[PDB]
Swiss-Prot record, chain B:
Biological process annotations from GO: 7-methylguanosine mRNA capping; co-transcriptional lncRNA 3' end processing, cleavage and polyadenylation pathway; intracellular phosphate ion homeostasis; termination of RNA polymerase II transcription; transcription by RNA polymerase II; transcription elongation by RNA polymerase II; transcription initiation at RNA polymerase II promoter
Principal subcellular localization: nucleus
Subunit structure, interactors included: Component of the RNA polymerase II (Pol II) complex consisting of 12 subunits.
Keyword check for Magnesium: yes
GO cellular component: chromatin; mitochondrion; nucleus; RNA polymerase II, core complex; RNA polymerase II, holoenzyme
Subcellular location: Nucleus
Keywords: DNA-binding, DNA-directed RNA polymerase, Isopeptide bond, Magnesium, Metal-binding, Nucleotidyltransferase, Nucleus, Phosphoprotein, Repeat, Transcription, Transferase, Ubl conjugation, Zinc
Gene name, Swiss-Prot/TrEMBL: rpb1
Name used for this protein in its record: DNA-directed RNA polymerase II subunit rpb1
Source organism superkingdom: Eukaryota
Record: residues binding Mg(2+) 2: D23, D25
UniProtKB/Swiss-Prot annotation, chain E:
InterPro entries for this protein: NA-bd_OB-fold, RPABC3
Family matches, as SMART domains: RPOL8c
Subcellular location: Nucleus
Pfam family, one: RNA_pol_Rpb8
Entry superkingdom: Eukaryota
Entry's Gene Ontology cellular component terms: cytosol; nucleus; RNA polymerase I complex; RNA polymerase II, core complex; RNA polymerase II, holoenzyme; RNA polymerase III complex
Keyword DNA-binding in record: yes
Record-level Gene Ontology MF annotations: DNA binding; DNA-directed RNA polymerase activity
Name of the featured protein: DNA-directed RNA polymerases I, II, and III subunit RPABC3
Protein family membership: Belongs to the eukaryotic RPB8 RNA polymerase subunit family.
From Swiss-Prot, chain G:
Name used for this protein in its record: DNA-directed RNA polymerase II subunit RPB2
Summary of subunit composition and partner proteins: Component of the RNA polymerase II (Pol II) complex consisting of 12 subunits.
Biological function: DNA-dependent RNA polymerase catalyzes the transcription of DNA into RNA using the four ribonucleoside triphosphates as substrates. Second largest component of RNA polymerase II which synthesizes mRNA precursors and many functional non-coding RNAs. Proposed to contribute to the polymerase catalytic activity and forms the polymerase active center together with the largest subunit. Pol II is the central component of the basal RNA polymerase II transcription machinery. It is composed of mobile elements that move relative to each other.
Organism of origin: Schizosaccharomyces pombe (strain 972 / ATCC 24843) (Fission yeast)
Residues shown, of full length: 679 to 823 of 1210
Miscellaneous field: The binding of ribonucleoside triphosphate to the RNA polymerase II transcribing complex probably involves a two-step mechanism. The initial binding seems to occur at the entry (E) site and involves a magnesium ion coordinated by three conserved aspartate residues of the two largest RNA Pol II subunits.
Subcellular location, record wording: Nucleus
Family named by the database record: Belongs to the RNA polymerase beta chain family.
Swiss-Prot record, chain I:
Gene that encodes the chain: rpb10
Subunit structure: Component of the RNA polymerase I (Pol I), RNA polymerase II (Pol II) and RNA polymerase III (Pol III) complexes consisting of 14, 12 and 17 subunits, respectively.
Keyword check for Heme: no
Protein name (record): DNA-directed RNA polymerases I, II, and III subunit RPABC5
Organism phylogeny: Eukaryota, Fungi, Dikarya, Ascomycota, Taphrinomycotina
Family: Belongs to the archaeal Rpo10/eukaryotic RPB10 RNA polymerase subunit family.
UniProt cross-references to InterPro entries, sorted A to Z: RNA_pol_su_RPB10, RNA_pol_suN_Zn-BS, RPABC5/Rpb10
Positions annotated to bind Zn(2+): C7, C10, C44, C45
């Protein structure tokens, strides 16, 4: 407890509290409400929205720029092998393509 | 469901904008892609724009036809609008699931004509009934007043927000809920596709003319405003002879302030009510309103009639400095001709000694909008952080984390 | 950055310009899908195609202002064809165009003389 | 883009010259805003400006827009038909596809819009197994290269409403910190695992 | 199956023409004061003035040729709602997708009721 | 600025005061948070050396 | 600001002239004015004034004095444009080409606001516009706007 | 019969009137002329030295829009080059793209003003040569210079249609107005106090009726008689455009027939 | 910087029509109306030479 209400100081560099362990826990500006409650995450993205009158309701226009960077693993079914392969042979720079192959 | 267009923004569906309480002011929205094939299932079978068109918050719909497709419906569900055989055809290519059969024409006279209701009632499911019965309505029509559908065909009145918006017994509500999302989900695709297509070639728009009240009928506006000065004159001076009086709630100075903000507020309505009651029914902005699409009676009266008086903390423009509203006025000037209260509209429109009063009333709902932006959020988390605990157990009862039971029903 | 290629507006990416395919439902009626050419050719075979008594329907509509194409449905009903109805139309057009292409090349030089010359 | 009246706008589409309502003069709108961004946001100035800009048509007289002057709508209007147009801004308009006149009359009239900053190609963002902090081992912040996003407390409280045990678990203990450890059965603590 | 349902002459006494461009509801009154009829009809193509006289018909078919040719105005719409009030009598309200109908007379006519749409026929 | 700041933060001064007229300072502050905490000098404003 | 309290300013010379005429009884003539800013006539008491405001349009922000027809909006809209205006785009300095500077945004083709206020000659605004004049047309057309 | 009735002409525009024809065809002609009408324009610059004030990026976009002569165009091999995309040669070759030069320097100390004149084609009387809309001037303005600010540019034009970039259409606008009074009421005029009283009659209004009556209005009537008015840029003579309009509009209808009678 | 060349809405060339424009509103005592003498009947583009700022004379004087 850098400052246990006693007037210690705990100055390490330029007379500034010494980052204690209790500081990280209940910051804020740290865990608790930043590393345990609301965590960033991955496989996501965002951008400006626009209108379109021509999509079904449950439809969402996804720009290729993003589609070319997501996923979305998907195990190899015996139903896919042929279909799924075409994707790889295509490339990760061609929409109908892929990135990474897991073994 | 993604897919997949070009250009770098998220295209999404207008009728879905209400749930995201956010326009296209250059807003951002986040996308989270699932991975495992077991979540892909959750957000498909439970959470779906379709199975989410009716929140239980209110057991009422949360999405509906809004904006241009709505303004369009009115201006097209009118029985003044016939369709040339020439299309029809063209517009039949949305539905999107078309019988293939071309609808039996309503007019076999010299030209073959289709009513605007006809081909509209096409994109509504088959076998949904409605008896809207609005205010004044008679054995007669009497004049496209009300609304009423049968075997998925309308026959009565005119479509507006009253019926294709999140209304109680709303048409949107009524096919949802009979027979579930889809063709339900298609409803928004049909009307929001048919009509947009109609409107494309019908054109619609507004200019100033739509804001400038009749010259003759504007004389009578300025008459009922200056004729409410006399109604203050008989108050500014008659309550200097102690002949008010006051009561209740008090006080005496306040029960004066009252009998004025009352006369000023009501006196305005007269000027605005007359300004509209004198505007051709076919006047843009007035029809945009009748539809429901955007804006209201108080938006028209303020644009073409007057504007003030503006307020602030529940009391017309406050004094200070000294005993005066501003340095272009005497002292003890408890008159509207000064204390927040404009006589003109955003057409002439506003006068200096007025312009400011307006801006400083404006900067109140301009911070009261700065709060609801945060506070509203704070109070939200409170509840959650005390109700996460509860949930409905397989026994038919809602219980605490610890099992401590809070309800014996599912909600009584 | 995600701007579709403009040249991919005037060049069929191995896409069959025209495609003729019946429907079902409707009976004796097919649907044509011209690609990378629309909003001009289409409007004609309509406000003109509907002029042939042989016709009973005249589709025509671009599905999305991003894809540069458009469909066309024709029903008829009952004897032929309707691949023949639209061609009888197209033919009636090219020939109706020259009607004016000639009047133009005829009346041009004709009101070119009144503004002096000479020769 | 936005005018000088707080008509924050964004581009929705880019129609080529033919499609746009070429009418009848016949010019073509450079941009076209929607009529529902008027009556509710009462911003009758945006209108006025356009009726007046126009009037620096067959004049070029730089039309002053001075905050409080005698200059009125009814004034500029007279100045309008003065050049052959409609004393109110309007004009008839021909559709780009068909040639049909539009039933309604369009309020067509110049104005200047401001090219706002923060463009799109600077605001798009996409993550997917990107770098991560060293101390917490979760995803970095905006910029860099180039993740991640952010899944608020607010946000999570909403899965729970629907009821997605698995989505929830996926977007917190997998799609960010996929970490496994081995625990002793008596005193539950990190072991000497291999 | 000749199922004519109307063969009576009417006349116009009032016409609106109430802030609608096309369409206009008119009024009949014929026979023994107790007839009266009222309907919306495109006033762009087939206007009608006072003392327009000339009968109308309805039926539901279909095959005839003369009837088809005769008249200069034809419509088509279901009925949906036919109640009875004030000395038996029947009042029928037929809709033509927007444009509305109203008649007041007892059995004979009555071959109607049936809602199987109608086809209205106007000859001048 | 307007130190402060850390002494509210509900209304006062934010709100526009009749007093401002002139050296206005019209209606030109930031959207939310620091509304009316920042202000701008009118065109005629003259500050006392 | 504290000197105001003891003073009594006027708005427009016209108001002062009307008050001077009344001091001896002079027609008002309110049946000749046409659509305009209906002032508060005539003049409540107040026998003589002390100062009169130069022009009510100098009562404006530096950035808000660039907005056509300010006194005519709903107010709330006025607050905007100014804050957003700063986020405009255009030429900021005739010598940007020489100044090495991080993040700079200029305009290929800037233009004079067409309908502009007589208060920019001073804001040197016509010389380095943020604007660009665009044949705009308010139409409900398609559904993308 | 007829079909066209011209009025005035000039050197940049062609006012006339269509007769026996349908609305569709009208519009479909408006469109044609505004888009798919082959033309030359420059669509690639290589910069060597440029110490002027216009950036390279800014020059490309500007050097582009400056119109060029096209005349015949659709008539190879010479006096007309086919799209550089579907060419019998490789990459870029003078057989399907016209080379242009720009070697502007500075010999003064006052101020330079380089116009469209200073460019140099090749001498293959294509053309070719840009244009000089200005009256006895030298062409549209390109860039200004002070001291030593020579720029050296290699420009080559290709063939393209408006569709591909507004840069190509040799057509300014078009000005049609079928039914100038209000026969077919294809429009509902907004009042505001009195209809035929607020809206101005048009110069082209004095060529018809049907005022008086109360006929009442007709309906068997289709829109015929269209008052167009084509204006060109000055890139290619004032129609030209029109003439070459249908030539590649008929051939656009044909494409169709041939893809349906062969099989 | 310098006239746009080609108006924004139409195609009407305006690169040519300025070296001549400026030599009237300050050299012939004709009005803003004088441009009408340059074939500017449309709005349109004619608000092009009019609403323009000569940002190069005042930029060109930074010589390296
Ligand atoms: Mg808002
Ligand atoms: Zn080549
Ligand atoms: Zn132009």
């Amino acid at each position: 407890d850098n400052e246990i209400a006693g007037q210690p100081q705990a100055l390490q560099k330029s007379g500034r509290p010494l980052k204690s362990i209790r500081a990280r826990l209940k910051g804020k500006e740290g865990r608790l409400r930043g590393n345990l409650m609301g965590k960033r995450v991955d496989f996501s993205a965002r951008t400006v929205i626009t209108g379109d009158p021509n999509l079904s309701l449950d439809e969402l226009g996804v720009p290729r720029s993003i589609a070319k960077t997501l996923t979305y693993p998907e195990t190899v079914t015996p139903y896919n092998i042929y279909q799924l392969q075409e994707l790889v042979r295509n490339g990760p720079d061609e929409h109908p393509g892929a990135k990474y192959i897991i073994r | 469901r993604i897919r997949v267009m070009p250009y770098s923004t998220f295209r999404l569906n207008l009728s879905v904008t209400s749930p995201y309480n956010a326009d296209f002011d250059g807003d951002e929205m986040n996308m989270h892609v699932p991975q495992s094939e077991e979540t892909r299932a959750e957000i498909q079978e439970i959470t779906m724009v379709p199975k989410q068109i009716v929140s239980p918050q209110s057991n009422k719909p949360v999405m509906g036809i809004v904006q241009d497709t709505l303004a369009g419906v009115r201006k097209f569900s009118l029985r003044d609008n016939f369709l040339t055989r020439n299309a029809v055809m063209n517009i039949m290519l949305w539905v999107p699931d078309w019988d293939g059969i071309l609808p039996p024409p309503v007019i076999l006279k010299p030209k073959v004509l289709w009513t605007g209701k006809q081909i509209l009632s096409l994109i509504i499911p088959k076998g949904i009934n409605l008896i809207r019965d609005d205010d004044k309505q008679s054995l007669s029509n009497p004049t496209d007043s009300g609304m009423l559908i049968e075997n998925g065909e309308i026959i009565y009145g005119v479509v507006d927000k009253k019926t294709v918006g999140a209304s109680q017994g709303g048409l949107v509500h009524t096919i949802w809920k009979e027979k579930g999302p889809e063709i339900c989900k298609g409803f928004f695709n049909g009307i929001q596709r048919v009509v947009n297509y109609w409107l494309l070639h019908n054109g619609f728009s507004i200019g100033i003319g739509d804001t400038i009240a009749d010259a003759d009928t504007m004389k009578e506006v300025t008459r009922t405003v200056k004729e409410a000065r006399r109604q203050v004159a008989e108050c500014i001076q008659d309550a200097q002879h102690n002949r008010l009086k006051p009561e209740p709630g008090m006080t005496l100075r306040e029960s004066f302030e009252a009998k004025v903000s009352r006369i000023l507020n009501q006196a305005r309505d007269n000027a605005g009510r007359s300004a509209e009651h004198s505007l051709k029914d076919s006047n843009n902005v007035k029809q945009m309103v009748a539809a429901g699409s955007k804006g209201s009676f108080i938006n028209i009266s303020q644009m073409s009639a007057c504007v003030g008086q503006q307020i602030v903390e529940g009391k017309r423009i406050p004094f200070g400095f000294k005993y005066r509203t501003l340095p272009h006025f005497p002292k003890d000037d408890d008159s509207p001709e000064s204390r927040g209260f404009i006589e003109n509209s955003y057409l002439r429109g506003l006068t200096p000694q007025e312009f400011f009063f307006h801006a400083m009333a404006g900067r109140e709902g301009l911070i009261d909008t700065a709060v609801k932006t945060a506070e509203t959020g704070y109070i939200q988390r409170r509840l959650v952080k005390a109700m996460e605990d509860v949930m409905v157990r397989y026994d038919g009862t809602v219980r605490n984390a610890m099992g401590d039971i809070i309800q014996f029903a599912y909600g009584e | 950055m995600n701007q579709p290629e403009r040249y991919e507006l005037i060049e069929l990416m191995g896409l069959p310009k025209v495609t003729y395919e019946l429907d079902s439902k409707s009976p004796n009626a097919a649907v044509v899908t011209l690609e990378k050419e629309d909003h001009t050719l289409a409007n004609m075979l309509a406000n003109q195609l509907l002029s042939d008594e042989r016709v009973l329907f005249a589709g025509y509509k671009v599905p999305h202002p991003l894809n540069h194409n458009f469909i066309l449905r024709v029903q008829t009903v009952e004897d032929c064809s309707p691949k023949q109805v639209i061609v009888d139309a197209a033919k009636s057009l090219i020939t109706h165009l020259e009607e004016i292409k000639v009047n133009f090349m005829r009346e041009w030089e004709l009101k070119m003389i009144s503004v002096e010359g000479v020769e | 883009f936005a005018s000088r009246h707080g008509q924050k706008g964004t581009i929705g589409m880019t129609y080529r010259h033919e499609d746009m309502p070429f009418s009848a003069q016949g010019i073509v709108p450079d941009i076209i805003i929607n009529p529902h961004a008027i009556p509710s946001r009462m911003t009758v100035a945006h209108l006025v400006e356009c009726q007046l800009s126009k009037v620096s048509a067959l004049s070029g007289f730089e039309g002053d827009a001075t905050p409080f002057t005698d200059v009125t709508v009814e004034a500029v209007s007279k100045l309008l038909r003065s050049h052959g147009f409609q004393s109110r801004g309007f004009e008839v308009m021909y559709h780009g596809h068909t040639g049909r006149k539009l039933v309604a009359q369009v309020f067509l009239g110049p104005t200047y819009y401001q090219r706002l900053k923060h463009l799109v190609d600077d605001k798009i963002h996409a993550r997917a197994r990107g770098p991560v902090q060293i101390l917490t081992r979760q995803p970095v912040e905006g910029r860099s290269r180039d993740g991640g996003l952010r899944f608020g407390e607010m946000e999570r409280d909403c899965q729970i409403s629907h009821g997605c045990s698995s989505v929830l678990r996926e977007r917190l203990f997998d799609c960010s910190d996929a970490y496994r450890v081995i625990v002793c059965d008596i005193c539950g603590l990190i072991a000497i695992a291999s | 199956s000749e199922s004519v349902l109307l063969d009576e002459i009417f006349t116009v006494t009032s016409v609106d023409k109430q802030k609608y461009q096309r369409v206009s509801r008119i009024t009949a009154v014929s026979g023994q004061n107790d007839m009266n009829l009222t309907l919306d009809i495109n006033s762009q193509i087939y206007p009608l003035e006072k003392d327009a006289t000339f009968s109308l018909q309805i039926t539901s078919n279909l095959n005839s040729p003369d009837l088809k040719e005769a008249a200069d105005y034809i419509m088509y719409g279901k009925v949906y709602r036919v109640e009875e009030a004030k000395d038996e009598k029947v009042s029928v309200y037929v809709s033509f997708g927007g444009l509305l109908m109203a008649i007041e007379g007892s059995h004979r006519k009555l071959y109607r009721l049936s809602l199987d749409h109608v086809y209205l026929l106007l000859r001048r | 600025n307007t130190p402060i700041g850390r002494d509210g933060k509900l209304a006062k001064p934010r709100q526009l005061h009749n007093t401002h007229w002139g050296m206005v300072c019209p209606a030109e502050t930031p959207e939310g948070q620091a509304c009316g905490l920042v202000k701008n000098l009118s065109l005629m404003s003259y500050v006392s050396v | 600001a504290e000197e105001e309290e003891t003073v009594m300013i006027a708005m427009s010379p016209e108001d002062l002239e009307a008050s001077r005429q009344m001091q001896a009884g002079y027609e008002v003539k309110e049946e000749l004015d046409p659509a305009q800013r209906v002032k508060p006539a005539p003049n409540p008491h107040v026998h003589a004034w002390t100062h009169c405001e130069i022009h009510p349009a100098m009562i404006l922000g530096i950035l808000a004095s660039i907005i056509p027809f300010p006194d005519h909006n709903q107010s709330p809209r006025n607050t905007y444009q100014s804050a957003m205006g700063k986020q405009a785009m255009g030429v900021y300095l005739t010598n940007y080409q020489v100044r090495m500077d991080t993040m700079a945004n200029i305009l290929y083709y800037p233009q004079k606001p067409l309908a502009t206020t007589r208060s920019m000659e001073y804001l040197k605004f016509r010389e380095l516009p943020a604007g660009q004049n665009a044949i705009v047309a308010i139409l409900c057309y398609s559904g993308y706007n | 019969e007829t079909h066209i009735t011209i009025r005035n002409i000039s050197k940049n525009s062609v006012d006339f009137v269509l007769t026996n024809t349908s609305l569709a065809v009208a519009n479909s002609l408006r469109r044609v002329v505004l888009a798919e009408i082959p033309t030359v324009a420059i669509d690639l610059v290589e910069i060597n030295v440029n110490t002027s004030v216009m950036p390279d990026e800014f020059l490309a976009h500007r050097l582009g829009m400056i119109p060029l002569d096209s005349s015949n165009i659709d008539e190879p091999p010479p006096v007309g080059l086919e799209y550089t995309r579907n060419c019998d040669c490789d990459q870029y070759c003078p057989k399907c793209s016209v080379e242009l030069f720009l070697n502007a320097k500075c010999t003064g100390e006052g101020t330079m003003e380089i116009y469209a004149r200073d460019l140099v084609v090749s001498s293959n009387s294509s053309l070719g040569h840009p244009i000089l809309a200005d009256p006895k001037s030298r062409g549209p303005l390109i860039c200004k210079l002070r001291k030593e600010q020579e720029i050296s540019l290699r420009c080559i034009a290709k063939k393209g249609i408006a569709k591909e970039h507004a840069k190509w259409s040799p057509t300014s606008a078009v000005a049609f107005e079928y039914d100038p009074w209000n026969k077919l009421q294809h429009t509902d005029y907004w009042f505001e106090n009195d209809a035929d009283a607020e809206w101005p009659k048009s110069k082209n209004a004095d060529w018809e009726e049907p005022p008086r009556e109360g006929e009442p209005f007709n309906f068997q009537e289709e829109p015929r008689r269209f008052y167009m008015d084509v204006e060109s840029v000055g890139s290619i003579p004032p129609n030209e455009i029109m003439v070459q309009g249908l030539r590649i509009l008929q051939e656009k209808l044909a494409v169709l027939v041939r893809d349906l009678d062969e099989e | 910087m310098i006239i746009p060349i080609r108006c924004f809405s139409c195609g009407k060339v305006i690169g040519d029509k300025w070296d001549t424009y400026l030599t009237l509103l300050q050299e012939d005592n004709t009005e803003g109306e004088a441009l009408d003498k340059l074939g500017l009947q449309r709005y349109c583009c004619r608000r092009m030479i009019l609403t323009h700022v000569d940002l190069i004379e005042k930029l060109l004087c930074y010589n390296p």
